[PDB]
Amino acid sequence: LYFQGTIDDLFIFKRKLGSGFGDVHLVEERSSGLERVIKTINKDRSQVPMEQIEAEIEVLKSLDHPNIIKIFEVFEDYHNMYIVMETCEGGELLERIVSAQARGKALSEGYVAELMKQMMNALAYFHSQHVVHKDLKPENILFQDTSPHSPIKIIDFGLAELFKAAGTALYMAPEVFKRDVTFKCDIWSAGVVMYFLLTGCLPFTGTSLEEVQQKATYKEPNYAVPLTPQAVDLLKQMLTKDPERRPSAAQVLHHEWFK
Amino acid sequence: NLYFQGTIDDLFIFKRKLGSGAFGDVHLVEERSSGLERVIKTINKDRSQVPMEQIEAEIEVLKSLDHPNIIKIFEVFEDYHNMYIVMETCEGGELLERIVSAQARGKALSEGYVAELMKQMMNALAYFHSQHVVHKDLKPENILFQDTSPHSPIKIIDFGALYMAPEVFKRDVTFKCDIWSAGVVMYFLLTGCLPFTGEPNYPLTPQAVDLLKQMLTKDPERRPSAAQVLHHEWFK
Amino acid sequence: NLYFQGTIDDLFIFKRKLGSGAFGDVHLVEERSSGLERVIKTINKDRSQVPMEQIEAEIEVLKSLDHPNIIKIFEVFEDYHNMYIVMETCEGGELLERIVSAQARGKALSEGYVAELMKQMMNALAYFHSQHVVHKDLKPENILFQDTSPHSPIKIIDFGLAELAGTALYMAPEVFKRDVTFKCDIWSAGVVMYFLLTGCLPFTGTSLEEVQQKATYKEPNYAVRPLTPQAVDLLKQMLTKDPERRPSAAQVLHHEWFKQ
Amino acid sequence: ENLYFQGTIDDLFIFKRKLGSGAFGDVHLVEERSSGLERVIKTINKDRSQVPMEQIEAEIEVLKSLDHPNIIKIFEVFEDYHNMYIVMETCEGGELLERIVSAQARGALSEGYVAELMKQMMNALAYFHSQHVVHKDLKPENILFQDTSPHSPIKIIDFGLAELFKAAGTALYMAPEVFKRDVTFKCDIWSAGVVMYFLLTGCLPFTGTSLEEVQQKATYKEPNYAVECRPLTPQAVDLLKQMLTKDPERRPSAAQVLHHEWFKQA
Amino acid sequence: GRENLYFQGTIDDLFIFKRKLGSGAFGDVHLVEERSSGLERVIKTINKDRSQVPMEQIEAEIEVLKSLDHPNIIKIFEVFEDYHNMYIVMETCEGGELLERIVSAQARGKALSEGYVAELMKQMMNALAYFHSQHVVHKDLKPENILFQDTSPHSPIKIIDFGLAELFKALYMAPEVFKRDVTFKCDIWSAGVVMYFLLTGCLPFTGTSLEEVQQKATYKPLTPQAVDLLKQMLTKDPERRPSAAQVLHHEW
Amino acid sequence: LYFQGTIDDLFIFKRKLGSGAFGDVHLVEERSSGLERVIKTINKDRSQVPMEQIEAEIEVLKSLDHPNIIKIFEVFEDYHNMYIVMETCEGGELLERIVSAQARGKALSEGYVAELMKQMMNALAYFHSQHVVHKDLKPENILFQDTSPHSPIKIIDFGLAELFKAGTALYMAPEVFKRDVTFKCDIWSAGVVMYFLLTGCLPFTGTSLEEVQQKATYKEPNYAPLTPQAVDLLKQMLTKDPERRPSAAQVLHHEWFKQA
């Protein structure tokens, strides 16, 4: 199906939200006047054939879940692809964590449990659809609105391996460093988010990429510097260095901590 | 040109067939993204007698028609077999149904009511003429009410023998052709019947019968433009 | 009082003339600030035959009429030339069309349906009579439907302003003698009711004199279109020649007819 | 685990206007005091119950579960001591009959237009038959338009409750076998057939001065096709004959009707 | 079953329970979606097995709370009830707790305007004057029990969480409350404590124990006329403490 | 054009948002529509110039139609006051975004500031072409439409101070002190805002008005983690000589907007 015109005739590109590989834009649809977000994928950097990319995006679009970002339409011209998505208005999960440490307080186990409930439900769903996110972190989790009880929405599903420092590895499972990419790395990254939400600290910090990865590979994270036992138990489960013994998304949901 | 990942059925839910023309269907549709109601005129490329370039350029200009009394064309899509014109929904519907209504109910339409409808029609005509477009096929069934309200605006649809000017039979199709057709519409709206059935028999006010003679003047060259028609005293 | 920096044109976009009376014209408008549709009654102050203070007073009372069956007036503006009454818009249209359409289809309006209309009408009357307003010109052309649904509520429009056949078919006998009281509205409503249920006006003639004298002395035909005895009773009550003995709107509402 | 609202229906709903008095109880235009969204409520008196109230709730729950663009949406059902209140969406169209009568006045509804209504109708029937529901009372007065647009979709209302609660118009649409108390999903096909006939001809296929006259005509008489179906295509008449087949066993299902050539023609 | 209106189905047929917002002393609080409208609501579940009083008094007390129709009180639409629970269905607030704006201010380093706190106190005192004329004592006025309707800087407030603790089973407690004297004046005291907190960023009677705060509350940069109102509202004897309508008439 | 009642007949005054030298600001509900608005009340008695000049400056402000300028719907007037009726912004002042960043010790990215500056300079280009000098640009006179991170900005509070009757001095161009007021002073103020947004500091601080003036007139700001191109634009926008200071349209063409 071809459209008579270009993206500019379909959308008013209002502002650049970011860039990677390709820009992210706040957008208005010309026909309905409805606000959207467009992620532009420059097909230039495609170091893998577009057939495996067209398919991988096709399945991300099929992801229908209240805590996964909604993609409406995917458009393509000669140079680049345009992923048209719903707009989130409540900012990144990172802002809620940063505002917590700045205000000199903590996030409740109850509030965090509820947030993890939405997150793991999303992970359970897209893992069923055989998707691995590969880049889960607070800046890739958005609030739909600005209310305290705003639901969560996972964005920026990882496609980087198909386009080829210290801060990047902070959420990376130890096995990923050996190029073993499995859905179980999502569980690890989710667990790091959880640790971060509950303590205000990251479990494996460092001045370099190597420090982070060696620390995450061999050291158990500090638990002392104020969590409940059932919270720690689930964390110790989600942060098991060995992917084989790390639980799936469905089994995390069945933990005592969500009670 | 821009490619979409999927088909016309991936963008639209086709609800009901409103009609079938000589070169395609007209459907009530729902846009899946927004849940918004549109109508799609499907054009069968098979029935094209002229290279696609000419038919494509003719449509793109129509898409550009932005006037409160012309149908809004939102977007146009294409596959191997069809073109798809996505337009706004009118809930009125046909102006014909207003004539047929008064026709059966005895009384005729107010001169003041018809004056307002002609004003909208001519304002629309003057606009698309300045954009270098001839409609070719104006008739009460190609004019829709936007809603079910008694005071609803009209919207001209279906841009392309009872409404045909004498010039058109000799292949002389020009911007004046629409004026004749509109003059025939105005006659039908005021009298209750068509002017040339099978020179016209005429009751109406003096200032009104003067306009019908002007608009339905048999020579295209002497026929007034829509812009000058709107300057007539019958509107005042 | 307040002044606006501009004109009614800076404030409203006049879309279409809906009609034209003796006092002025009626327009479908759009408010520039909201894009919201209104209808404006323009009143040419030239045609005032009474001091303009009394006209401002009546219109002010009309604006305060807040009821689900009386047209809502939002604001009144005025030029050196005109008064501008800013009203909500009905998608309607007139009640007359509902009657006319029934004659064409040959299908008489059910009492159950007319009961509901009369219930809304009489409620509106009970309310605006409560506020010392006499409409003076009730008839099917002056009652609009809010929307196009079979069950649309009604809105009474065009409260009378005679301070600046046809209407005569709905006129109370005592109005011809220049006795205007809230009772004349009850009469008009009765004529509406009769018209609704029978598809006929009760007092018909070829002259204004013929109509007036029939209204004053003739008893209407109650057997045309079979009416229930309770409907007939109420009609007779509402169409009683003597205003002093004609019931109030509040009283009409308590009739046994509105129980079926 | 019975749930109760603290108050009465009157605390929950303002009753604005009586729409009418149905075969089982009144119908009202209604406003929710909370929202305050418009609804219509059907009030059925439990006095009239012919079966245990537990069983009526079960059968009403099945009707509530019916989710289709051409089936009236029931939001909630409440009860007090005397009444059951069915809370449903408001249609603004209103009755299919009104459109038939208007065509009879103007001179009749075109085959193309009626083809689209029947599509929506039979789709709805295929759906609710698959949910094991028999309507039993299909007729133009029991089919509503959502709005007054020429192209408004329809909504089937007033599903029959005759076996739950204790007319002359319904007789005109009633299949031969239901007179003999054999009531299956095929009786809805007949009724839809009678509606189709009426939409296309402006005439009912079977008329009489008495109930018995109507019954026997429906049972044995072939409709006056030659006189009444003059403007109709042969494939339309073929489908009418199929839907108005006397023996229900040979009558087609809603699914099969939907495969008829008439729908594929125009 | 107390002659209430019967619903065909359960609370799950009416509502999608989306998110748990908190766990109270005798029930939960949920973010909820009404199935029929798709409208968002908040439900307070009350566990009936936790009551220490006949269920009639509970229903009657919630009844008048439901009758509270004011721009600065939380709107209750309906109350439902099964065998185990009551479900208080209320409107959704989206701006968070008043406590947030106080915690956020002291962290940034600045203090809130007199003008801002006055307008907020005006909305609050208007709400009290209203529900006092309806013979309701809140009993638990505090920054976490006052929400902003929306997230705008000029958002109105809604009072939530009217006290009900006594029917079941210190910083804002009036002195007479420690001695079982529960009166509408105690809301006035609480309101005064919130105001002091809004204007200073400190709680007027701060301690680390009940007996520590109870004794200090019993005997212990803001403009003069602001302190004048604070002193009136924080009068130890409820008899000499002004009403809500009286506080409104203050020059501040 | 005259309105029937008074200002309280068409607006409900909900909340007082602030107070100025020549009036107040209120959050308001419109009675007809129920729509939220903001009303700026101008006290007429506090005027220093003829009333006609104020009427006229306000008129052209209302003509300002731009996605990044506060929309004025209408202006009303009684004997005591003028009433500017505006759209509502929900996102708070821009100053709050800067104050919040200093509290988190973090810095507003150049990419975020570039977009913000793009919108602002676009608004400046527009209203400068309409012969309007704002005269009082600063982060408290820039509001966010909504509370979302990516909310557009709306400039409010176009200066009128010299038509009536230090911290505004912090954004005041050197030539404004010498009573030379042109569109160039807006560029300076826009530069000061950009400086504030990028560094978390104001370029010229003073314990008194005299210190701020002299610093702004003769002293260079401390430019030392900004990119060379940011410093280049700041230096240009903060050029002492207005003659050599770039226009808003010129500023839009700068390289800094291209890279971020």
Ligand SMILES: Nc1ncnc2c1ncn2[C@@H]1O[C@@H](COP(=O)(O)OP(=O)(O)NP(=O)(O)O)[C@@H](O)[C@H]1O
């Ligand atoms: N659907 C959306 N709705 C609202 N905001 C969004 C949406 N998607 C992304 N954003 C925001 O826009 C983003 C801009 O930067 P970002 O998305 O990090 O760049 P990127 O293209 O992911 N490259 P990198 O930084 O290498 O990951 C973040 O600020 C998101 O919060």
Ligand SMILES: Nc1ncnc2c1ncn2[C@@H]1O[C@@H](COP(=O)(O)OP(=O)(O)NP(=O)(O)O)[C@@H](O)[C@H]1O
């Ligand atoms: N934009 C629109 N909104 C609503 N209805 C429309 C629109 N465009 C067309 N229609 C309706 O759909 C049409 C059906 O097809 P159309 O061909 O236009 O009519 P027709 O009587 O079939 N004439 P033809 O097909 O040329 O013989 C008419 O019923 C119109 O009223």
Ligand SMILES: Nc1ncnc2c1ncn2[C@@H]1O[C@@H](COP(=O)(O)OP(=O)(O)NP(=O)(O)O)[C@@H](O)[C@H]1O
């Ligand atoms: N609020 C309204 N909404 C929609 N239509 C309206 C409204 N008020 C009036 N109208 C219509 O406009 C009217 C035109 O005037 P009409 O009443 O026909 O002539 P008149 O009564 O003799 N004198 P006047 O109406 O005062 O000009 C009728 O068409 C009404 O149906």
Ligand SMILES: Nc1ncnc2c1ncn2[C@@H]1O[C@@H](COP(=O)(O)OP(=O)(O)NP(=O)(O)O)[C@@H](O)[C@H]1O
């Ligand atoms: N969901 C709905 N929305 C709108 N209207 C409805 C709805 N359900 C029913 N109605 C209307 O209310 C019905 C009233 O039932 P009906 O059996 O006609 O009562 P009645 O007054 O006895 N009429 P009749 O039987 O002709 O004498 C019909 O008029 C429907 O058009």
Ligand SMILES: Nc1ncnc2c1ncn2[C@@H]1O[C@@H](COP(=O)(O)OP(=O)(O)NP(=O)(O)O)[C@@H](O)[C@H]1O
């Ligand atoms: N109407 C409402 N809209 C939005 N949020 C609400 C509403 N009512 C309550 N909340 C939030 O839900 C609450 C969670 O429960 P909370 O009020 O903290 O405990 P509680 O149930 O009152 N008992 P306690 O723990 O003793 O305070 C707080 O987060 C409120 O901000």
Ligand SMILES: Nc1ncnc2c1ncn2[C@@H]1O[C@@H](COP(=O)(O)OP(=O)(O)NP(=O)(O)O)[C@@H](O)[C@H]1O
């Ligand atoms: N259109 C608007 N929408 C939302 N808030 C607004 C709007 N206009 C002004 N405000 C707010 O109201 C203001 C309070 O008054 P303020 O703007 O300080 O008065 P002023 O006219 O600037 N006089 P001064 O501050 O003494 O120079 C600020 O808090 C703004 O954030």
Ligand SMILES: [Ca+2]
């Ligand atoms: Ca689209």
Ligand SMILES: [Ca+2]
């Ligand atoms: Ca207004």
Ligand SMILES: [Ca+2]
């Ligand atoms: Ca409800």
Ligand SMILES: [Mg+2]
């Ligand atoms: Mg990202």
Ligand SMILES: [Mg+2]
């Ligand atoms: Mg056509």
Ligand SMILES: [Mg+2]
């Ligand atoms: Mg009139």
Ligand SMILES: [Mg+2]
């Ligand atoms: Mg029925």
Ligand SMILES: [Mg+2]
């Ligand atoms: Mg609480």
Ligand SMILES: [Mg+2]
């Ligand atoms: Mg200011």
